[PDB]
């Protein structure tokens, strides 16, 4: 119908090779933070057949056993046997980690008061919130994440023992306009691809994916006789994980955020401590956006911030409310400036960003879940 | 003023470590395509001190000397001596490349007519165009790219011989609304950080960056006494390239596209042949968007497509014109469907995507430059 449109988002499972890397990078970060809350961490992970490589820069007082940390993360994901294509017990773990560049350290944080630490890099970051779900997230990405979580649940509980950890999902929703906001109408198309054992047949998989995965996740009111299902569309997915496709940290940044809604500034989250504004300022911007929506000021909002390396205050803060506020964007920006301090050395205090909770963020999206500090709205004064 | 806002985009130079990886990945792709136009290539590159690692999946009839291809790419970028932190002559080149998964091959392209080849993965992709510049790109990202290009020019011509290849820039523009379109007013803030030799002092660098870089790129009509300049804001950037910061392919996807404008579906471009719709469908979507703007149908437009692995036709196509067309989005979508075929096996023909031109795309953005096929608008019939 006129005024309607389709929009698609995707998500991936815990054993998707890029997500393996994000989780390992954040397991490394958490291990450092457990011993040194001020650790400077920039840990990239690369995964291919039989290999996890850590590359990057860490300056920390912690003593971290990288072999143990990496292998325990892979064990948790479920890659525990050569029959599955990857095994935490027997893979190669290679480490190419150096100290943080002293030139960066001197320009960012050396001899600086914590509240006045400089941004760890330049960059731009966005925060988004939408009233279309209680958790202020787009329905497309929420459903896509939940489909992957359901696969992992049914794998771990033994219901569908042919499942393996590598999966991808994609959800297309038909939306209608509503005064600048968007309203989901129906699910138009669902894709699910998941790695599987050599014995199970395609028809058994497709039936299970429809009846035990989709129907257990997606409300029936969104599904109808016209909904299109692409279930195991490649026909065979026995080879998977890093053996099927190289993984790298920071290659699922749209899955990690809003599924394509809002906007993205390009920076990856995993493997980075709070001085890297790619993560901390994106978390703070989500917190601002969600606070504006939960505060009743907007129904939908996009916030941009930006930084220069070594400079503590943002270079720019901007807000767009899609026509969903009675207040001008100028007024909302004044409210934001009166209620939030987006220096990284203040964000760290407000969002408790030295705490080792980051591995938990590294699958199923960083936003919309589990009442992390950036998901608890701030009560606004104005 | 009310109705105005700030917006920031960034770009990076040819020697930025992530961009080094993109360029190497596409040098590898081009080397394969020179000998085997049908090569299946998924080449990731990782860079750290003294190391280029290639990881991924290639099935090809070509005989490629990876040592030579990698080292020649690094030579071109300018890393030719240990004094600069990296040297093509003496770095380590490690290769962890396997064949493409046979399970992918059978589901995507084996025994398929070329026009009916399946998408090489699921995913979503966007194309964007804006009439604010002749090349239909946002001014923020165009200026940011041009600042990095100017640095490389002045490095290569010996004017500023203290420059090294690793650089980043960022441009904040004040915009005003214009009937759904956006109109740039002035440059609010510029950041430039660039790697340099041990001898040159900060004041010499800052003066040169203002007088010989910014003033040679940014029209004076956009600069005024209030413009803020953050030039070498870290104070020291002698350590750079992969030694200062690990690089990975596909970690500059917003730099590669629209600088944060429009939208992004998450997929990286470099190192991938045309069957990977992350690249080919994003290129085709840019071509659609630019064709609509150059055709006079819109002033600003965002196109989304999406795919399932193994399926040739897009699962969804959607268009949003920001209120800048007299035609409804429904009508524009009908025009697009009548004029474009977004199957990957047709895109390859329309955009000549077996030709080895990809290394040229891998710095300074994939869009808005050099009349690549996706930048030449299609004449639309309706
Ligand atoms: C008066 O009330 C409203 C409420 C919403 C909108 C609106 C909208 N209407 C629409 C109507 C018919 C057909 C297509 N579209 N379409 C979109 C999109 C897109 C949709 C499909 C392609 C891709 C971008 C987006 C968007 C999504 C992600 C990232 C960036 C932008 N926003 N958006 C909107 O706000 C307009 C007016
Ligand atoms: C009637 O004519 C128009 C023309 C343009 C707009 C408009 C707009 N007005 C605006 C006015 C005052 C203050 C802030 N904003 N602000 C934006 C933004 C953003 C701006 C700053 C934060 C981040 C997103 C974006 C956008 C950019 C990148 C990615 C996604 C969305 N689009 N956008 C628009 O279209 C509205 C009406
Ligand atoms: C399709 S692979 C990307 C293309 C691949 N690099 C190549 O060489 O063609 C991308 C992701 O899809 C999933 N995948 C891998 N093998 C697959 C298969 N046989 N069927 C469906 N999806 C698959 C995995 O999640 C993988 O990380
Ligand atoms: C600042 S580094 C990212 C943080 C880094 N990984 C760490 O360990 O803190 C990101 C990019 O900024 C640039 N960069 C590196 N050293 C820098 C310095 N001393 N001053 C300014 N920018 C620098 C390079 O382009 C590099 O790829
Ligand atoms: Cl992927
Ligand atoms: Cl949006
Ligand atoms: Cl970077
Ligand atoms: Cl935009």
Say if the Cβ atoms of A107 and B234 lie within 8 Å.
yes
Best of B141, B164, B188, B233 to disrupt the A interface by mutation (most A CBs within 10 Å)?
A: B233
Break sites following residues in chain A (C–N > 2.5 A)? none
Mark whether A282 and A377 lie in a shared domain.
yes
Q: How many CB atoms lie within 10 A of CB B296?
A: 10
Using an 8 Å CB-CB cutoff, list chain A residues near B236: 103, 106-107
Q: Which atom of ligand 1 is nearest to the CA of A300?
A: 35
- The rounded Cα A326 to chain-centroid distance in angstroms is 31
Mention every residue, 6+ apart, whose C-beta is less than 8 A from residue A209: A192, A194, A231, A232
- Report yes or no: A29 and A41 within 8 Å, Cβ to Cβ: yes
Q: Which residue has the tokens 């129906």?
A: A186
Other C-beta atoms closer than 10 Å to the C-beta of A18 total 24
Report the distance separating Cα B249 and Cα A44, nearest Å: 12
Residue B70 distance to chain A (closest CA, Å): 19
B/e letters for A90-125, b = 16+ CB within 10 Å, e = fewer, are ebebeebbbebbebbbebbbeeeeeeebbbbbbbbb
Same domain, B88 and B179: no
Distances (CA, A) of A108 to A114, A119, B270, B323: 10, 6, 31, 43
Alpha helices in A209-253 (DSSP H): 215-217
**Would the CB atoms of B48 and A55 count as touching at under 8 Å?**
yes
Cβ burial, residue A364 (10 Å; 0-12/13-18/19+):
buried
* Documented resolution in Å: 1.3
Over A250-279, what HEC string results? CCCCCCCCCCCCCCCCCCCCCCECCCCHHH
Contact A159, A151 (CB under 8 A): no
Beta strand pairing status for A300-307 and A80-81? unpaired
User: A253: which chain B residues are within 8 Å (Cβ-Cβ)?
Assistant: 253, 266
Residue A143, CB-side half-sphere exposure with 13 Å CA sphere: 29
- Co-location of B181 and B224 in the same domain: yes
Same domain, residue pair A329 and A347: yes
- Residues B202 and B347 placed together within one structural domain of the fold: no
Total number of domains in chain A: 3
**Domain coverage including residue A68:** 12-114+240-276
Q: Write out residues with Cβ below 6 Å of ligand 1.
A: A 3, 5, 7, 177, 179-180, 182, 260-261, 322; B 263, 302, 304, 318-320, 329
The pair of three-digit structure tokens given for residue A159, joined into one six-digit string = 């219901």
Q: Hey, how many other C-beta atoms are within 10 angstroms of the C-beta on B354? A: 15
Give dist(CA B121, CA B63) in Å, integer.
26
Strand-pairing partners, residue B247, are B47
For residue A193, give the nearest of B246, B250, B309 by CB distance. B309
CB-based contact, A185 to chain B, within 8 Å: no
Per-residue CA distances from A288 to A293, A296, B111, B259, B281 (Å): 9, 13, 52, 22, 34
- Closest residue by Cα to residue B217 from B314, B125, B143: B143
Q: How many CB atoms lie within 10 A of CB A152?
A: 20
Residues B229 and B375 in one domain: no
On whether both B187 and B334 belong to a single domain, the answer is no
Residue numbers after which chain B is interrupted (C to N above 2.5 A) read: none
- Here the CATH number for the domain that contains residue B211 is 3.30.300.10
Q: Tokens for B240, please give them.
A: 């750079």
| B124 shares its domain with B205 | no
Q: For residue A271, which of A73, A10, A49, A9 has the smallest C-alpha distance? A: A73
Tokens of A208: 């299970």
CB B3 less than 6 A from any atom of ligand 2: yes
Handedness of CA A162, A165, A167, A173 (dihedral sign): positive
Same domain, A32 and A80: yes
Q: In this complex, is the C-beta atom of B51 within 8 Å of any C-beta atom belonging to chain A? A: yes
Q: How far is CA B382 from CA A125, A325, B284, B314, B377, in A?
A: 40, 38, 19, 22, 15
Q: Which two tokens stand for residue B299?
A: 């002033």
B227/B152 same-domain check = yes
A129 and A183 in a single domain? The answer is: no
A146 is catalytic: no
Contact A243, A86 (CB under 8 A): yes
User: Secondary structure of chain B in the HEC alphabet?
Assistant: CCCEEEEEEEEECCCCHHHHHHHHHHHHHHHHHHHCCCCEEEEEEEEECCEEEEEEEEECCCCCCHHHHHHHHHHHHCCEEHHHCEECCCCEEEEEEECCCHHHHHHHCCCCCHHHCCECCCEEEEEEEECCCCCCCCHHHHHHHHHHHHHHHHHHCCCCCCEEEEEEEEEEEEEEEECCEEEEEEEEEEEEEEEECCCCCHHHHHHHHHHHHHHHHCCHHHCCCCCEEEECCCCCCCCCHHHCCCEECCCCCCCCCCCCCCCCCCCCCCCECCCCHHHHHHHHHHHHHHHHHHCCCCCEEEEEEEECECCCCCCEEEEECCCCCCCCHHHHHHHHHHHCCCCHHHHHHHHCCCCCCHHHHCCCCCCCCCCCHHHCCCCCCC
The method recorded for this entry reads: X-ray
- The CA-atom distances, in angstroms, between A273 and each of A144, A276, A338, B219, B281 are 28, 6, 26, 38, 35
Pick from B224, B257, B276: which residue ends a domain? B276
How many angstroms separate the Cα of A343 from the Cα of each of A187, B119, B349?
Answer: 41, 43, 50
Phi, psi of B104 (to 5 degrees): -65, -50
Q: Which of B244, B246, B248, B252 to mutate to test the pocket of ligand 4 (most atoms within 8 A of CB)?
A: B244
For chain B, the C-alpha Rg in angstroms (whole number) is 21
Which among A233, A245, A246, A255 is the best mutation to test ligand 3's pocket, defined by most ligand atoms within 8 Å of the CB? Answer: A245
Distance between CA B20 and CA B70 in Å, rounded? 10
Strands B163-178, B123-130: pairing kind = unpaired
Report whether A131 contacts A137 (CB < 8 A): no
Question: Nearest Cα to B275, choosing from B90, B98, B50, B116?
Answer: B116
Kind of pairing between the strands at B40-48 and B51-59: antiparallel
Residues whose CB is less than 8 angstroms from the CB of residue A353 and which lie 6 or more positions away in sequence, other chains included: A273, A274, A280, A283, A347
Q: Which chain B residue's Cα is nearest to A259?
A: B265
Q: Are residues A294 and A376 in the same domain?
A: yes
């Amino acid at each position: 119908e006129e005024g309607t449109f389709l929009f698609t988002s995707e998500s991936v499972g815990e054993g998707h090779p890029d997500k393996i890397c994000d989780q390992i990078s954040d397991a490394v970060l958490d291990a450092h933070l457990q011993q040194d809350p001020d650790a400077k961490v920039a840990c990239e992970t690369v995964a291919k057949t039989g290999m996890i490589l850590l590359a990057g820069e860490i300056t920390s007082r912690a003593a971290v056993d990288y072999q143990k940390v990496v292998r325990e993360a892979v064990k948790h994901i479920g890659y525990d046997d050569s029959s599955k294509g990857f095994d935490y017990k027997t893979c190669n773990v290679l480490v190419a980690l150096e100290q943080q560049s002293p030139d960066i350290a001197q320009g960012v944080h050396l001899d600086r008061n914590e509240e006045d630490i400089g941004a760890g890099d330049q960059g731009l970051m966005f925060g988004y919130a939408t009233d279309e779900t209680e958790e202020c997230m787009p329905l497309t990405i929420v459903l896509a994440h939940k489909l992957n979580a359901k696969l992992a649940e049914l794998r771990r509980n033994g219901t569908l023992p042919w499942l393996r950890p590598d999966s991808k999902t994609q959800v297309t929703v038909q939306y209608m306009q509503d005064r600048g906001a968007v309203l989901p109408i129906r699910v138009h198309t669902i894709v699910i691809s998941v790695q599987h054992d050599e014995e199970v047949c395609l028809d058994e998989m497709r039936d299970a994916l429809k009846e035990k995965v989709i129907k257990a996740v997606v409300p029936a009111k969104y599904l109808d006789e016209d909904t299109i299902y692409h279930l195991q569309p490649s026909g065979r997915f026995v080879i998977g994980g890093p053996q099927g496709d190289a993984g790298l940290t920071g290659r699922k940044i749209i899955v990690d955020t809003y599924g394509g809604w809002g906007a993205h500034g390009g920076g990856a989250f995993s493997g980075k401590d709070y001085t890297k504004v790619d993560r901390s300022a994106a978390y703070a911007a989500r917190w601002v956006a969600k606070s504006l929506v939960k505060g009743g000021l907007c129904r939908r909002v996009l916030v941009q911030v930006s930084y220069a390396i070594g400079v503590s205050h943002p270079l720019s803060i901007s807000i767009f409310h899609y026509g969903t506020s009675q207040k001008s964007e100028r007024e909302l920006l004044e409210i934001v400036k009166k209620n939030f301090d987006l220096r990284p050395g203040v964000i760290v205090r407000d969002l408790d960003l030295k705490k080792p909770i980051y591995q938990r963020t590294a699958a199923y999206g960083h936003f919309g879940r589990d009442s992390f500090p950036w998901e608890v709205p701030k009560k606004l004064k104005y």
